[PDB]
Design a protein around this nucleic acid. Sequence first.
RNA 1: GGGAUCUGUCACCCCAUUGAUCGCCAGUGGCUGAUCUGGCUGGCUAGGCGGGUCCC
Length: 17
Amino acid sequence: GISYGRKKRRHRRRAHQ
RNA sequence: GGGAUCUGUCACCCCAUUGAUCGCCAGUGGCUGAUCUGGCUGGCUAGGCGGGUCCC
């Protein structure tokens, strides 16, 4: 029906770790 | 071999596409599926692997 996430269109951000 | 730190690599969450590009649909809303940037002053005693350093 509806996704749990509010938007969930961008993620991944830890290249520098 | 273990622990800590850094880097690289592999995933997740939130916000911005009235930030840019591609694809589908449509008169402008939705979809991250890919890449980049900003917020790590955000969550790594939240995870795995490799290398360097230090310690044992």
